[PDB]
Amino acid sequence: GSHMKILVINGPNLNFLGIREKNIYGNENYEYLVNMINEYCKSKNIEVECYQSNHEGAIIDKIQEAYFNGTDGIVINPGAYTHYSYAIRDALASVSHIKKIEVHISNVNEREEFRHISVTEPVCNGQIVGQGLKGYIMAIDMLNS
Amino acid sequence: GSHMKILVINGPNLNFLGIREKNIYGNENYEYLVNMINEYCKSKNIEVECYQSNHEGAIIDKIQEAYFNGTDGIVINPGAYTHYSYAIRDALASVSHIKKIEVHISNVNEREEFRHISVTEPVCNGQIVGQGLKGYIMAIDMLNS
Amino acid sequence: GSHMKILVINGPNLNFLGIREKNIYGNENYEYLVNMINEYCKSKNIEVECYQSNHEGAIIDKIQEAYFNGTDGIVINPGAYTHYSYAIRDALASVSHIKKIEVHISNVNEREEFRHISVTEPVCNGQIVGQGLKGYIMAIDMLNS
């Protein structure tokens, strides 16, 4: 369209930023994250929607909807689904014309062993990890490149 | 009843047949598949319902509903849930009087390593793989045997 | 509050107690279990809610709601999600002020290999297994200690 259209998907538990495990995920809350993204996109003339769900199937539904509605790019933090949801992987693979960047707040490489592997990353166009909430902004920049 | 009653369940991403990964899943779309099944069942005097969902829990709900509504057989392509959904496995095991056939469009034996194992198949009465959309018809035939 | 508030969460397939695999899960049905819990809690002046869902995301939603509504303790039988749902694990970890006890009806240690490991248990305050429906009562007692 006339402006780039990005969808930011946050997966399960991400609406509990600021409540959950503060030493790992930071002190700022989910509303803070959404506001940060919205204000950054406004400043870049990027249309953005921030979506969050705890449901694997709803995430997939939202990726499918992005196919039909002119979405150019997806920034996705699948939450714990990163480590096991082959269904979200297949959904991301099904939208071949949408650029996708995976984001993790924490340095997943240095946490529990099960967090070291992402089953979604192989079908994404990029990734970021371990940069805190700024990783979302870095992902937007990757898409707006 | 007076006629065999079959439920066909398609799991996540299967509504994107014809859009997704065409070299793997074929050129025909989900509506084509549903029509094919409906016309074949009509010709055999089989009552059929085709259902699709991206939600693991909705699949389980639909299997449970089949217990109460006189369903004789289930044809199920769990999609990527095949490889990890012990919850769908348990659901299929919970309906001991319903015959179940698992279907895969693609030859999962010759794809990525994670696609080689099915956690749902051990509780099904049969399976088909690698026959394209015709596998659904072959599954119906297995049930109508 | 004036009385302890407990939430009992049953995961997928548990509403099919008494129908499913009777040699493993027992002859009594889910309504029997709910009644048993309700009558025991009434006798102890404990406020209880019994919730069941087949949906992973709904379970997570319900754990999150417990954060806001003054829930003191959760008894959770995740069903098959025990073996793979890192998303439910993270949800349980996100509610650091709610005591959590994991329950399994069957002796999961002596069943199929995939049932031997729980990804949810490491973030719970306790567990019970292999005691039949009485395990739920034992879990309530653990919380009311």
Ligand SMILES: O=C(O)C1=CC(=O)[C@@H](O)[C@H](O)C1
């Ligand atoms: O944002 C992140 O780093 C992550 C979020 C989740 O919620 C985790 O399950 C994941 O392992 C790491």
Ligand SMILES: O=C(O)C1=CC(=O)[C@@H](O)[C@H](O)C1
């Ligand atoms: O129909 C199939 O062959 C399959 C469908 C899915 O959607 C896949 O995740 C699965 O590994 C194979």
Ligand SMILES: O=C(O)C1=CC(=O)[C@@H](O)[C@H](O)C1
């Ligand atoms: O209550 C239990 O013992 C269990 C319930 C489930 O429904 C199972 O998938 C799990 O492995 C054991």
